Amino acid sequence: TEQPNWLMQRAQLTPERIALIYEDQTVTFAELFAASKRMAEQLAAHSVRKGDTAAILLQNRAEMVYAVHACFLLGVKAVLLNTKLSTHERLFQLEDSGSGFLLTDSSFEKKEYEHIVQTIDVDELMKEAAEEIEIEAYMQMDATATLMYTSGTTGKPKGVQQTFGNHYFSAVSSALNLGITEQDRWLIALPLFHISGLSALFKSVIYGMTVVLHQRFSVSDVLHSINRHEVTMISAVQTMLASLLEETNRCPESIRCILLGGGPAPLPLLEECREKGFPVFQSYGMTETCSQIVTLSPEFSMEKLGSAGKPLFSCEIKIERDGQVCEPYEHGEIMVKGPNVMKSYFNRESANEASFQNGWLKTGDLGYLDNEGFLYVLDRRSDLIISGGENIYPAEVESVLLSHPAVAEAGVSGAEDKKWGKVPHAYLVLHKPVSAGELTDYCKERLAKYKRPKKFFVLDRLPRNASNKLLRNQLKDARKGELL
Amino acid sequence: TEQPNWLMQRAQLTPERIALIYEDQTVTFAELFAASKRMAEQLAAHSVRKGDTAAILLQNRAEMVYAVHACFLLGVKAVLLNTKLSTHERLFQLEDSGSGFLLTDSSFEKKEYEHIVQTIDVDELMKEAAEEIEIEAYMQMDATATLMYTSGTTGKPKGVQQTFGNHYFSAVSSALNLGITEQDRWLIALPLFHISGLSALFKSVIYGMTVVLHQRFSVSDVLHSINRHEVTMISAVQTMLASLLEETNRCPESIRCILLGGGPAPLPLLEECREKGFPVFQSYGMTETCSQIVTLSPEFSMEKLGSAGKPLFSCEIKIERDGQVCEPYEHGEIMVKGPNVMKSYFNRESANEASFQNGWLKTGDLGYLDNEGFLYVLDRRSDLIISGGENIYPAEVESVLLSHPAVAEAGVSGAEDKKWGKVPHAYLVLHKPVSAGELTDYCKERLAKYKRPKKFFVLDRLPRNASNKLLRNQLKDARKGELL
């Protein structure tokens, strides 16, 4: 039921091994444990207690890594907040998660959260003296460790409860797939508030593996850092991968794995990576599975071009249509099972009832298996748009647009975009006149920047079926004029 | 609470990878699952049912690997029988374990067991037609998978219940310690009825790693097999390591890990291996921990010479004397904890109550921890003699000797042996005269070869404490004459 705290045990086993490279800082596992314990001590002085929930709002920094581990050492659930959200979106997640604390810094406006939660500046925190405490020496396998919001298909996101067991099994199953050696070093340049970034911190302490951490993604900095630090592993969404190949015809020799996830990649990009020797491992995974649950090796990447691979060890996948399992190549809903699959959504009894069916999680994605069991994800959802690896839910964007008094009805769908893959376009029926600029200013207070419509169209009615349900796939073809 | 059957998933994932090389003949994971399923179907036709217990009595052969997996595919607990035991010793274990079946071959005297268990000849079995069955597609993590007998300190051994979860976590923790790559291959030339050998079969399917299986250990054949099949990993007890060093001064280039366990090694041997580049990882582990639980890497083998190393990830060790905490360097009983620790001894109420203390397992070994947490096991037991990595319990050997009509009292202690480490000597008080030849003939029917006393001595009294308990340590000193 329990394991020794991973960071604590890792510091006991290999104290001097490097845990984190960040800018000009190198942090050993012994130093990481000491810093996380000290932050935990300072948090306990601000009355944080075992069983509490603490939200984290930070850019990728060493201090963010300390805060996550410090929560674990106190027995406190960590809510990872997306730094690009508007205040309005964060406030809902602070309230819905039951967070009693917000750990952030001066680059965010702490004042507008004072009413809901006790706000703590991580940099001022670390300057304070505090009593020593007895830390939580054990992680309970079925306890919720972290919460991440996603799947806003009804208009508001759901908090995914990720257990310590989920994270352990994700890291173990990935190591069984990719192999692990003492020389491996993993570069993380995507957000730590997504499981793509955060999972590397759990791999780090479980494997005893260095993470090279970047605050932002810059191709030139990443190539320099790979060379300076002998990086062997790197995670990317397809936009990042495309930017890398835009920069160089050759992959750095030390890279043995580019773990690609977070949405579909254009086929010519995968073909060019294979032709030029970039060792891309395409993968399929989500917040609910605590990162990858299916991965595709480069040796199959051309024969199975388009596939996300096979399930990781201990994990399982099937394709069902209306509760009947599908034959090979027959399209249906992707359902997954495994020790890395989330406990449940937080405080969403009805969604949990619908999403789980006898131990399997319904993903809401459509796909098929070929006759050797390789997974092919079909890009057919209209309730989800993926831009630069960031999920966007039309129901959320439509809810915000409807709230404007000039707006009678609203529909949002994804438009092709050479850089971002897809971007949201808005389709409106209006009571009163309103310009695109007005609408964009109105959305800025309520939606993260990547969620706001890149184009607006005006219609007399939107396409609906006989049950009055919006037909989002038909928006791009309806009689419309562009709104300026 | 369950995982897909490891062999089934591994065959699904990498069917063409080599699972087993035996007499240089190759078995892929696809072929291994097919042979294991077919033997399971043949066993079901002999009325073997989910929930039964089957004992296995086989030398190291491919068919013994099939049998273990076939049991898993039927949901049957597998009792691994030591092939060196007398018929008498094996009959006790068949009855104690509740085995309904015995899976063996014509190398063994099957007629002796058919009064207690239904005996099945694996070679005859594989020639039979049988109907297809629905195999058990999942392994229950807390269900007992295998039973192995050990710890005969009361005079009869105890059956260790090893769960699927125990074997999974043993394999994962070892991979996290040693690293794992697609090129790794593991050579096993020690009995599959010990967990030293059996654990490699589970590493094999979980990692997707070839096992090179030898029926016996010959140094020249092991060396030829390493270079022929590019072996990288090999398991050994110290007698095996000494034979290797007598044969060659150079370790084969492909070997990256010699995993040493099963008892203490002479320090000049460990120093010589380090001097000549043999990558020896000394370890501490037992049946009850489903193999290694503490291991030491070559980089510390000089500075920590005599150490067993540090606990594997997820595992823990402490030292206690009289239930009190022991400071570093303070001697006490080694106690261990981890997901690889056995469920319990089978139907041994008093032993389970005495051996488990608040979630920790008392090992019966004495040791201490240095100020960096490295474990030093002190060779101090007199209730256990280790001969060539085989455990010998004086209580068992004394019981056999006492049952002889001429024998009034008996005490067995370990004598130094250059080749085997320790061999048993017997110390006897006699009712009537009896020769050493007659006692040896008597012991042939009741004890495995390595357990039989190599020398007998006759005394008028044996060393005993105030409560008339034998003081086995002091037998060596006693006033005695050799019995010819």
Ligand SMILES: CC(C)(COP(=O)(O)OP(=O)(O)OC[C@H]1O[C@@H](n2cnc3c(N)ncnc32)[C@H](O)[C@@H]1OP(=O)(O)O)[C@@H](O)C(=O)NCCC(=O)NCCNC(=O)CCC(=O)c1ccccc1C(=O)O
């Ligand atoms: C793609 C990223 C790196 C782009 O950010 P960046 O700021 O560098 O963009 P630039 O090219 O430099 O230009 C900045 C302008 O572009 C805007 N912008 C930035 N991001 C987006 C965006 N997503 N969509 C639309 N616009 C964007 C900026 O606002 C700016 O605009 P201007 O001011 O100039 O006008 C960055 O977005 C990024 O890091 N994306 C990745 C986020 C992510 O990690 N998603 C994955 C989520 N899914 C999961 O975590 C589960 C699957 C998983 O675990 C996984 C995923 C990937 C890899 C591995 C795994 C795994 O299994 O381990």
Ligand SMILES: CC(C)(COP(=O)(O)OP(=O)(O)OC[C@H]1O[C@@H](n2cnc3c(N)ncnc32)[C@H](O)[C@@H]1OP(=O)(O)O)[C@@H](O)C(=O)NCCC(=O)NCCNC(=O)CCC(=O)c1ccccc1C(=O)O
């Ligand atoms: C040491 C071995 C290989 C010796 O056997 P072998 O038959 O090859 O000996 P020879 O020198 O060739 O001479 C043959 C005659 O020698 C007699 N004899 C054989 N063995 C012994 C013995 N142990 N003691 C005394 N005499 C012996 C025979 O009479 C033979 O005569 P013939 O009949 O041939 O004419 C062999 O004994 C051996 O394989 N020992 C290892 C057993 C073992 O596996 N012990 C480990 C048990 N402990 C565990 O499994 C838990 C710890 C663990 O998991 C582990 C252990 C080691 C390494 C790694 C791990 C791990 O954690 O994964």
Ligand SMILES: [Ca+2]
């Ligand atoms: Ca500053």
Ligand SMILES: [Ca+2]
């Ligand atoms: Ca990672």
Ligand SMILES: [Ca+2]
């Ligand atoms: Ca893969």
Ligand SMILES: [Ca+2]
């Ligand atoms: Ca953005």
Ligand SMILES: [Ca+2]
């Ligand atoms: Ca054993």
Ligand SMILES: [Ca+2]
């Ligand atoms: Ca007890």
Ligand SMILES: [Mg+2]
């Ligand atoms: Mg950038």
Ligand SMILES: [Mg+2]
């Ligand atoms: Mg099996």
Ligand SMILES: [Mg+2]
């Ligand atoms: Mg019978």
Ligand SMILES: [Mg+2]
């Ligand atoms: Mg031999």
Ligand code: NA
């Ligand atoms: Na691989």
Ligand code: NA
């Ligand atoms: Na200590």
